[PDB]
């Protein structure tokens, strides 16, 4: 009762009208003869039954909807990027506790950090030589440094207040590890882990455009090359399915982060 | 009368109950005297100055600054805030120049470059005329905030707690930078100070207020000390002993009990 | 003597070659159940001197002799209270105290420890802030919990680095009286650092001052003749109180002039 | 007074060199197992040293242009592109964040286009302009406009509450207020927005020119991968270092510039 009439007109009405006019102006745009992109009526009506209404309709070696494909390039972000967080923080903590290692391998784990995720494919795919492992590896390399360079920085930003209250106590060792240092780094793991996913999903939806297979990347770019009637209709649909599934991965960590953050 | 507050209050409408942060206060301020406000946290004294300066909406009453109601914040009730209210990306001279060239769009740059010098050098700020608010000490950046407030010749110089986060060495020095500065300008000053021995030194009429669900002027204890003050014989005057004891007696025993 | 700080001197080897020297000669005979306060000009060095007792720093020449023995490293029998809020934001109030008790009551019984922390967060005050994150507590409430942690340890000493620096002098006034209630009964031997004279003549049993400059001496070890059951609302009426409060102000003024001479030596 | 250089010589200069030595040696010692198809450090710096290192900026073919041009050519698109985003992103970001009526409506649908992958716009961009060169610039533009537009509106709305208070007491409202209390307050927020809006631009110009061919690193890494050769495997590694090395300068040059105009604290 306190939100239907008051809270409603700041979060669901303003966006819909703002999105509604965006669709309307988009509709007006296609009136131009030279505007190649089909209008929203064409792109949302002429591709309605094949994909949106009934996903999960495997009809060939590579013939799927936005289902068994979104959950085929997202399963590589679970099998991958899970070894990049388990083996990205422990190396991120082992390096940093002693400010001597994090002086020699800082300008290595930083130069490699600013390497585009999809440039690791040619050498990664030239070593594994297989489509699936080579794609997972790109995820495992694209998102470690966004975690490693945040966990390590988080540990070294331990306030002197926490150390001082630790030195005065006879606290040192494993006991000192799970109460004063690691819980003070969780806030910095989830601000880098958030960067990880989003920068890894970026790599698996672009690095899959080159190696082929099943999943977006083999759908968002497997029909542009093959020109057909209403070809662009099923590309925009994927571009919408992407960007919201990729939005329910930055909010997911944001949701989990707020539930465990040190506050 | 240079200012009048009479029969004014303020009630906050909340779903958990109408809260009254100020109950029918009433006081008058003479032209050319200090006034200081005391009270525990939640006493509403900070809210009171926000109301006179215009930051709040006077409810069930209205101020009568110079026989007129308070309309909106302006460059005649300039208020020195907490957090030092200093822009960190402007040097001191330009920071002061912000106030001077804000409500004087009539005189040329010739006067602006000279007016600031008089109201900036006289407060011991000439060597740091080009420093940025990143190396200045906390007790030193309050001397530009005061300089900014008085550079526009305000009618009433409202002071939120200026030295509420300073050290004793600098805190003692600052007061000597107010009496002499204020004597030349003889501008009414209303200030909030939690620290007794500072109200008793500066103020000319200390008005302590009570705590609780509401508020009201508990006492109007006035300082009879000589207007010139040295803080060396003020303690030596026995009148200051019972005088201060009265404040502590009527600031912890009754009125406010924070605990 | 319960503590025999003697010939405790500290010299800092500045990398530039200045070789700054802070403490030259310090003598103390802190006895059992005695409250002591360090009052200085904020430049004489009080946190460093307190740190020596705390153990976080080691005296270059000489050393402390607490209870007729040398202190080597920080210990949980000399729990301190830092200026900056030393709370852990990810632990609630009742859990912060449990942090210190586990490192001194290393054993005993967990069931007992729950009672001990509960009783040690009530006398200091609170009793309602328990189970409240130390990120929305009042500025003056985040400090009384820190004092609770140190007293809960049941130490032979309790250092108080100036805690009342971020507190306006109305919550500080409301908090000094709380210490009176705490130390009236329990065996306490604090050595606290402050630069506001009001608490020096209020909580202390023997105020010790310090001369400003690289020649920080013990100044004058003034003694306050007031009955132990102190109360701010009656102690002030003691005729000798205001007499002594001027004395400390008198001494601090001399150092204020001396500090100008120190600047005049190099600047002027 | 030369000890100043020596002071940090053994602190943050030597250890990195030692770190490379271990990495190269372990990499070199790794290139002994037959089941390791990549080349060792000596191969990937002896096979590729003659034509790709000695004389960069060398032109011999229609689309090779050596390696010096393919790194300068890519930077050209991030110059001509992402400069419209720099000027057309803050202008739209300021004009939308100052008004809470519009930001409350548009922002929920601008945070979806922010997370769209940089290479998901290529099929539409490539099918809209119907050309190669002015499609790799649009993909940069529409990808580095959200990291700036969606991080400036945060700045224009997170102005310190005290700054505004100084405005009201001074009767500072209007055009003067915008230039004197608002815009300089968001300068730190813009540069932290186009610091992350430049890594995502280089990250997209090196991958948006390998699906459309052309001249630039990305059209050379892919070009020098399909043509299997004894020297083939070396460029994909030598160039991979340049991309990282040049990606650092772009992400650091913003910091250096943003460290000299930002509102310090």
From TrEMBL, chain A:
Q: Which gene encodes it?
A: nrtB
Instruction: Write down what this protein is called.
Output: Nitrate transport permease protein
Species: Nostoc sp. (strain PCC 7120 / SAG 25.82 / UTEX 2576)
What are the leading ranks of the lineage? Bacteria, Bacillati, Cyanobacteriota, Cyanophyceae, Nostocales
Automatic annotation (TrEMBL), chain B:
Please tell me where ATP 2 binds in this chain.
135, 137, 139
What keywords would UniProt list here? ATP-binding, Metal-binding, Nucleotide-binding
Domain of life, per lineage: Bacteria
Q: Which residues bind Mg(2+)?
A: 82
Q: Does the keyword Nucleotide-binding apply?
A: yes
Which annotated residues bind ATP 1? 12, 42-47, 82, 161, 194
Please tell me where ADP binds in this chain.
19, 42-47
- What is the recorded name of this protein? Nitrate transport ATP-binding protein
Task: Please report the organism this UniProt entry assigns to the protein.
Answer: Nostoc sp. (strain PCC 7120 / SAG 25.82 / UTEX 2576)
Top-down, what is the taxonomic lineage of the species of origin? Bacteria, Bacillati, Cyanobacteriota, Cyanophyceae, Nostocales
What gene is behind this protein? nrtD
TrEMBL record, chain C:
Per UniProt, where does ATP 1 bind? 12, 43-48, 83, 195
Indicate which residues the UniProt annotation says bind Mg(2+): 83
- List of residues binding ATP 2: 136, 138, 140
- Where along this sequence does the record place binding of ADP? 20, 43, 46
Q: Which UniProt keywords are present, listed alphabetically?
A: ATP-binding, Metal-binding, Nucleotide-binding
User: Domain of life, per the record?
Assistant: Bacteria
Q: What is the protein's given name?
A: Nitrate transport ATP-binding protein
Point out the gene that encodes the protein: nrtC
